[PDB]
Design a protein around this nucleic acid. Sequence first.
RNA 1: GGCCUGUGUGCAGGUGGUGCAUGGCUGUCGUCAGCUCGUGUCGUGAGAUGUUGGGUUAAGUCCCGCAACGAGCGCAACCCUUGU
Length: 114
Amino acid sequence: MAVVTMKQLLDSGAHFGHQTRRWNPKMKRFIFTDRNGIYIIDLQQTLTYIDKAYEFVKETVAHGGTVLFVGTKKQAQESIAEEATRVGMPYVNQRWLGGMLTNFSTVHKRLQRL
RNA sequence: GGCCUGUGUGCAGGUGGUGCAUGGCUGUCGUCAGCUCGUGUCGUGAGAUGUUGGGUUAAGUCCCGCAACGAGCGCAACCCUUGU
Ligand SMILES: [Mg+2]
Ligand SMILES: [Mg+2]
Ligand SMILES: [Mg+2]
Ligand SMILES: [Mg+2]
Ligand SMILES: [Mg+2]
Ligand SMILES: [Mg+2]
Ligand SMILES: [Mg+2]
Ligand SMILES: [Mg+2]
Ligand SMILES: [Mg+2]
């Protein structure tokens, strides 16, 4: 089950990877082929794992689970922030403070102060 | 009862000793700006981060990214005088 189709996935160009100086050998199984120094991701595996995460998140939301969105790259901060505020979900987009999850009691004081 | 003259009883009485046992008070480093704690994280262990680098100020006064998030004694203010 999917909503986003392969053709428009190619149009968006999500299959592109990094150069030959950064590829992790543990990602060889994912890697299909390299053309002009850029790797191509396996779209079948991508769709299957997207489906897996799809039912996982469906069950999590049905059972009442909370998911935090994390992203700091400049090119996605605005998009993540807009989507999170439209969907009413807590999010972080600009800076990740050290030990925010392992240390929640201390920052509870900061939240109460705010 | 108060007070004390003669006997003592305990005992008063000592600027006699011990600031290498002490209380309190005081001088210098220096009116220098440095010195700590809670949680977390890392390593086994004595431990490290926070307190690193750049900029700025008389000052750990402040800004920027960084496993750090906060707080404390200090710094300035609140007190006196002098200037209208
Ligand atoms: Mg003597
Ligand atoms: Mg002496
Ligand atoms: Mg000194
Ligand atoms: Mg350990
Ligand atoms: Mg150190
Ligand atoms: Mg240190
Ligand atoms: Mg620090
Ligand atoms: Mg120091
Ligand atoms: Mg200080």
